[PDB]
Amino acid sequence: VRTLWLRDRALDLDRVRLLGVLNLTPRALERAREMVAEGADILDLGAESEEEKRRLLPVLEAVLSLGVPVSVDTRKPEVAEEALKLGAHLLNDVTGLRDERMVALAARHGVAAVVMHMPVPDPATMMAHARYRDVVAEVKAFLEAQARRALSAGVPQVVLDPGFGFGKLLEHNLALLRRLDEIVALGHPVLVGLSRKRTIGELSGVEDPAQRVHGSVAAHLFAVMKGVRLLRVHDVRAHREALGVWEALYG
Amino acid sequence: RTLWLRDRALDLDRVRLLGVLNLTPDPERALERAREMVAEGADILDLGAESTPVEEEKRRLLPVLEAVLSLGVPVSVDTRKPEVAEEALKLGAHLLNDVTGLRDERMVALAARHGVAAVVMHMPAHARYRDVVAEVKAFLEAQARRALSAGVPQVVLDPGFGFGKLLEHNLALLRRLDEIVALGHPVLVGLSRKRTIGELSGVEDPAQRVHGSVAAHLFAVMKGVRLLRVHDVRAHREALGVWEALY
Numbered sequence: 001v002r003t004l005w006l007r008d009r010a011l012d013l014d015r016v017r018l019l020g021v022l023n024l025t026p027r028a029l030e031r032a033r034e035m036v037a038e039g040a041d042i043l044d045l046g047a048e049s050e051e052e053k054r055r056l057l058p059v060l061e062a063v064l065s066l067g068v069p070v071s072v073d074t075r076k077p078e079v080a081e082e083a084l085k086l087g088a089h090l091l092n093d094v095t096g097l098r099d100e101r102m103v104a105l106a107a108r109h110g111v112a113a114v115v116m117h118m119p120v121p122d123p124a125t126m127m128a129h130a131r132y133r134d135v136v137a138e139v140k141a142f143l144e145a146q147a148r149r150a151l152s153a154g155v156p157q158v159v160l161d162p163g164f165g166f167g168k169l170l171e172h173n174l175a176l177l178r179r180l181d182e183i184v185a186l187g188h189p190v191l192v193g194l195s196r197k198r199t200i201g202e203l204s205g206v207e208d209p210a211q212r213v214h215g216s217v218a219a220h221l222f223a224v225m226k227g228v229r230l231l232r233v234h235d236v237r238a239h240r241e242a243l244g245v246w247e248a249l250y251g
Numbered sequence: 252r253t254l255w256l257r258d259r260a261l262d263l264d265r266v267r268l269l270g271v272l273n274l275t276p277d278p279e280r281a282l283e284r285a286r287e288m289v290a291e292g293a294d295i296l297d298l299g300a301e302s303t304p305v306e307e308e309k310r311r312l313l314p315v316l317e318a319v320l321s322l323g324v325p326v327s328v329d330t331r332k333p334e335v336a337e338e339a340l341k342l343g344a345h346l347l348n349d350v351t352g353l354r355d356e357r358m359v360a361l362a363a364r365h366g367v368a369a370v371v372m373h374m375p376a377h378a379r380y381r382d383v384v385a386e387v388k389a390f391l392e393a394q395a396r397r398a399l400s401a402g403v404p405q406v407v408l409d410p411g412f413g414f415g416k417l418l419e420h421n422l423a424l425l426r427r428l429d430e431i432v433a434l435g436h437p438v439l440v441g442l443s444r445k446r447t448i449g450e451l452s453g454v455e456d457p458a459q460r461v462h463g464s465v466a467a468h469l470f471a472v473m474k475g476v477r478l479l480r481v482h483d484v485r486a487h488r489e490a491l492g493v494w495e496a497l498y
């Protein structure tokens with residue numbers, strides 16, 4: 001019944017959908033072609049960590065020719081503007097649409113936006129702000145506030161993401177994971193991204209970030225069991241395979 | 252709850268892994284493989300020498316079994332022949348894994364004589380059932396009672412995924428796995444690399460079915476299963492680290 005707006009079409013959330021990550025930070029149309037072949041539903045491109053335009057736009061234009069929905073991971077409006085101008089289908093804002101300029105672009109271009117949580121919009125100081133009295137309550141309050149605001153300003157739809165690994169201690173990431181159902185209960189499609197994250201390395205005992213697929217799949221299946229229908233992942237094939245089994249069983 | 256392993260007990264407060272060591276073509280590198288699986292977190296080693304082919308050729312199992320037992324890790328012997336089990340049990344085996352479901356009174360007697368737990372797996376092959384779940388449950392229960400009444404200290408039930416079962420049958424059992432767990436005995440399952448996983452995940456090569464296998468096993472864990480028969484021990488160890496911390 002639930003769907004995700006992608007600028008010119010609606011994507012069914014009757015089954016879990018995957019946002020395959022394409023990181024352009026220090027042609028990738030080929031990596032994009034592979035991810036689609038592997039089952040990615042949306043391609044998430046980001047040159048975040050202008051020089052951002054130089055790295056992102058050229059690739060964005062090439063990948064868009066595949067006809068698959070493209071999400072742009074950027075916090076700078078000047079980038080979003082140009083990304084949507086070329087045809088981006090989804091705006092992924094790690095700073096949670098704090099910037100009105102971002103809200104405006106979304107509503108103007110008629111594109112949904114992902115509101116992710118960060119205690120503070122500054123990546124360099126977020127870890128100094130992981131001191132929530134009640135992390136689940138506070139994240140829900142922030143998400144719901146950014147959502148109502150964005151929706152009233154003309155944003156077609158908003159996807160909520162608790163932002164795992166952003167200004168959060170393991171204790172906080174765990175609490176949010178275990179009570180993820182409470183975020184889904186807010187009524188908006190929920191997106192999570194635990195691929196490669198420190199939380200996974202900590203719980204699975206894997207120090208190398210590129211070797212965390214089994215723990216990430218496990219965390220993601222748990223999230224799916226909690227009602228999440230959108231996953232931001234690196235190993236697209238691993239999740240398509242796992243979901244092929246999980247969705248046939250849990251349902 | 253706990254699982255009796257001949258001279259020690261294993262708590263099932265967390266999922267336990269039975270690492271598979273296949274000693275069939277369809278030597279010494281095997282011990283190295285066992286040590287690796289132990290290093291990766293395997294709680295028990297399941298050694299088998301007959302695809303599921305002749306009793307005399309115990310040269311397959313015994314030599315390896317003796318060497319592996321020197322690692323101190325509990326060993327499960329996957330054999331359906333009393334002669335093999337007997338020799339395996341006298342050497343120190345800790346668990347009797349019988350795919351023919353303890354139908355042979357001789358294996359029941361031996362298990363009881365050596366005071367060793369036995370795995371009762373279901374296997375009819377002809378994949379036709381009026382009601383596979385009801386039928387598999389009735390078989391597992393009946394055999395478990397036959398075994399306990401004979402002195403077997405404990406019995407582990409296993410629905411035998413893939414054994415004389417089509418996809419529909421394996422799916423039904425998985426979806427109602429809680430009903431098998433509800434029989435009061437520890438439950439073991441093994442879907443690693445099996446056809447069911449290939450069918451659901453769309454993976455042609457059995458050797459590349461780890462992701463689908465882990466997903467199936469986590470579902471089983473959610474249903475109450477605390478014993479898994481796997482090939483990729485590390486993958487399961489990592490996935491369970493996350494899963495058990497969250498669930």
Ligand SMILES: Nc1nc2ncc(COP(=O)(O)OP(=O)(O)O)nc2c(=O)[nH]1
Nearest residue numbers: 021023092114116161163164192193232
């Ligand atoms: N909506 C959303 N966007 C995100 N962007 C970057 C990262 C962190 O990923 P990272 O370690 O930087 O690796 P990569 O960007 O290559 O995926 N996580 C999220 C997330 O969790 N949710």
Ligand SMILES: Nc1nc2ncc(COP(=O)(O)OP(=O)(O)O)nc2c(=O)[nH]1
Nearest residue numbers: 271273303348370372409411412440441
């Ligand atoms: N208790 C128990 N024993 C078993 N022995 C062999 C197989 C079939 O596994 P297979 O694909 O042949 O691989 P391997 O026997 O090498 O482990 N499955 C089971 C099972 O599911 N449960």
